[PDB]
Design a protein around this nucleic acid. Sequence first.
RNA 1: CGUCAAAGCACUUUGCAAAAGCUAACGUAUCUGUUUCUUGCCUUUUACCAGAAACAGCCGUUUGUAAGGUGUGCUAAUUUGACUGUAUAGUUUUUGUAAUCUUUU
Lengths: 98, 293, 99, 193, 193, 96, 144
Amino acid sequence: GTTKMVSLLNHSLNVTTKDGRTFVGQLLAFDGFMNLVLSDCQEYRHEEKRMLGLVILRGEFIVSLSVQGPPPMLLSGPGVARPAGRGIPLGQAPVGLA
Amino acid sequence: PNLQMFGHTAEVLVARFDPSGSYFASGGMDRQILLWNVFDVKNYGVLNGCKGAITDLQWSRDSRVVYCSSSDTHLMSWDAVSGQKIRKHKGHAGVVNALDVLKVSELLTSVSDDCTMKVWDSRSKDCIKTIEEKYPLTAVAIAQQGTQVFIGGIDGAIKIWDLRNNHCSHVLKGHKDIITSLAISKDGSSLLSNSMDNTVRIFDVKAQRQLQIFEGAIHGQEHNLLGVAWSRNSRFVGAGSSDKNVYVWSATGDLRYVLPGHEGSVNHVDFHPHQDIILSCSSDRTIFLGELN
Amino acid sequence: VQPALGPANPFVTKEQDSIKNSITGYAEREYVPNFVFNQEYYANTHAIYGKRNFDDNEATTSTDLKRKSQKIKERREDPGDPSILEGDGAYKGPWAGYG
Amino acid sequence: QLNERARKWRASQKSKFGVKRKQGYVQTEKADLPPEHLRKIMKDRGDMSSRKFRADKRSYLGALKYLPHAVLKLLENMPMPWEEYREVKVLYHVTGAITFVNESPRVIEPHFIAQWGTMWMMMRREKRDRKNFKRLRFPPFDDEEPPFSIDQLLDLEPLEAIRMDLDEEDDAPVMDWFYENKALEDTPHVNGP
Amino acid sequence: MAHPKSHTNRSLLRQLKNTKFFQSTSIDWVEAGLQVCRQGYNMLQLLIHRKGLTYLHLDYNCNLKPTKTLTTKERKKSRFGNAFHLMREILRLTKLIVDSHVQYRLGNIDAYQLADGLHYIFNHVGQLTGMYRYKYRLMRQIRACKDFKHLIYYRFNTGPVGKGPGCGFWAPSWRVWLFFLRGIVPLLERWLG
Amino acid sequence: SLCIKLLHETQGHIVTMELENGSTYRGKLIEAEDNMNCQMRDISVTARDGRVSHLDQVYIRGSHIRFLIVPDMLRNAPMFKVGPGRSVPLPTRGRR
Amino acid sequence: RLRTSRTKRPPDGFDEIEPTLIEFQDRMRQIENTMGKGTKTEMLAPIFQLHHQRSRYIYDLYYKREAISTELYNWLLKQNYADGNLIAKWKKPGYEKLCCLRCIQTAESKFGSTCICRVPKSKLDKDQRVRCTHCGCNGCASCD
RNA sequence: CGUCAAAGCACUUUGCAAAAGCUAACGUAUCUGUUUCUUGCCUUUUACCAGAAACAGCCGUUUGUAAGGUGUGCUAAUUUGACUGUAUAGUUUUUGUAAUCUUUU
């Protein structure tokens, strides 16, 4: 399967681990064991913070996943114009009759 | 100026501005929607794919997505920024004739020759509702509220249906023949309607009687669906005719501007959302931007 | 509209009065779907024939088309059928003649 | 009254959009005729003598311009020795004014080499075991004599022509088509026709 | 060799097929050879008569000759030109190639003789058709077809079985004359037009 | 899988990691594994107490690793498509 | 399409059909070789009419009476005894008794379309029933 | 082979567009002409000899796209793409060494 997991790719995530710690950052790479790779990571042990960088977690260590934010980031047809004119028709009445 | 731009190969039908007032779209029998600028009046994308002829455009109220109503059951959807296909809303078993859109660009209504009205979501690719009458339907309009949908058929009976109830609440009367285009005001308070009796009547939305029967805009053997519009103020009414003339009314029951220019039957007249301009289209393969100083 | 104004030339014969693009009459381009023109043309012809015929021939109908076909159909010779070059069976086809 | 309204309506919509319909008419492919239709025209016209075709005669010179182009389509189709006759396609002026052979020979190359090699097999073998080889006379038919009646040739029957003795045991996977015109037109060993 | 130019495909033979004046059908090769060989006979006759040049008659073997014997005043009217004659002698060839098939579909000839026949014709076109005297380049297409003969014979002929007739390996000698028409056609229209 | 190849690519650089033990180790990485074994040198351990030490050579078991911490340039590295019947990611010229 | 001795034989059912198919060839030559009479357009009318019969025969033998094997019917078409292009239309409704493929060409006609024959007798007049010029149709419309 | 998405499908007829982007057979084929020059054989010019450069035609090829035709299916078949595609309860991840208590700030 893993169809849902590809959809998460390149989003800022909030990942709770078995220790209780919570890592945060974008998701670059993903596995069948749920090994996650995360970019520009920050733990929140708890009024606390730390800067790590690139972090590769195991599957054993991970508990839950949750998105913090969204993913980060016919030329010219034939037609031609002209000016005015607005000719008057001598005849009245509809197009087909006469 | 006036600006009579050429471009299409065959009979053009529908031409509309964005809600913003920065583009045209146009497309008829060509199987080609051709986008335009307003203020250096040049073409843009050739939206290609529809395997039936187009019968109705309508910009999404985001001014990005466009919706068609081909003669081969499809209702297409186009990214006007890029110009790629999004979907093919496959449903009806016949030729679609009209489209309508809401504020919320999400819901669409179409009208077949299967005698079936159908409401569409831009997320499902299927019908939300299916209202089967009996005789092939032709014109439809949805209110600003996102509640009342007006149907126009062959009986001369503009029926009114809500999205909650789905009951024949009311039926407009006194129109002897055929409806070619409904049109709700920018209030949500009154319709316009072209009959084959040439009585370009206005109706009420809430008591529900007539207001003013306008008379002087002929349909004949061609059997094209002719259009009507409300001006941005809702002062003027712009009805085209098969007499090559754009009969603009005063909405008080007075013909003010009657400007010719086309060499063939006229189809769908429109108005710009702010500055006084008139889009007028016609089998002829031509289009005008009639102004008032 | 803005009318002309003046006394109007009194002499003016029939031949001068009409506005003519090309001698006989004014001629201008038209944009009628052809199907309308073809449909229109036939109806007009029937009326012209009818006066010459002197017969109205009733009105055009539904179901009575089948009666009109049968009435035409009955007189017409039976198809020979395939495989008979010769007569006494023979193979008259759509060629067959009513009589 | 409503039933008739719709009947008129639907038809008008059908002329505008109509399943298989062009601008109004029903479009179709230019279907090719019976062979006898062309053959008759050649007989009836003859030597452009009679008045009945005094109209055509203006066009007939008009054709002259495109004669050199008819020769060239014809010779690039010549049937080849191993073939008994070959069927072709044609454009004719309904006036009976020219016949354009409208095929290109078109052939699969290792195969065609093979064939022409196999000719050069028989053709040497046959020169050594004949003794009295009678080469053609030329101006095959005398000057005065008028050209051949086509209807005579359709009776004659073709007569057999070169080919080589392909033993079944050894040349199994070519014997069933090593002497066709468009070899394996029917199989998946080629596009289609 | 140039590297080919970008272009949309013109194709004459599918334009003519799109007007209502040409129809399509499928027939036998030798029929449509005779068809041409005739068509051209008439297309010259009608030109000869329209000039009122009615004291000359073309033989059915594209051979032009006077009957009356003329004054110098009546000869200057005859004096047909470099084109018509080239156009004619291209027919005289087409007649030989076709007749020499007609003739093998009577039985007269039989295949092996016919292949040889064909081969003799191409390799000797200088001698059967007096064309070279209206288009002297032509003596290049001739010289080549002679310079194939040599090359083949002294590879096939020799073996242990070499003297006369037989051969019939015409394919190379045939090519030469096709590619010639490729280049003449276009010019010979302009001249005939 | 890509989460393993990234590891193999940080061989040579200096790595930080965390074990179930509770302590973190820092040093040059010499060899890794698909299991997540490791082989490092000049390691500077720091436990829960804060106690620093030195370990010349070390082997590990992946099962015991919680997570790694890898150099910054290893985010521009290529992440391939892999395939159904291949172990190592690598780039792929052939069919698919 | 001429087959000779020393060739592939056709399928088994064939040689019952043989006589009738020769009956057509014999008649067809008799039209070619003879001279017409009226206009040079009319002169060619009896080719198309005959050709229509040859195909109906086979269209009859395979689709109604059922006296032929699929193997043979196909062999007949890819041998040009019967026009498939035509027979195709006979299967389609509306064309169930059509004369000649040439009467259904919009592109032949001065303007517009369709050999007057193609029109259902119902509508058109008594004066203009007449006959087609191509083939000498006379009410090819499926019914009238 | 498996999944998902798109699309009728295979075969065919015309129309309309393109076809050095980084040195390379649109065509492992190959013909005629015009102009400008150079040499041949020559005096009637044409018709030609055999080299060059510059332009042209013609016989063909490929691709995309649009509309059609035949046969088959639109209660199906086929094509086309895309893909982080495999099954493991017994030691390195998904059938647990967990559970529980107490003290310090």
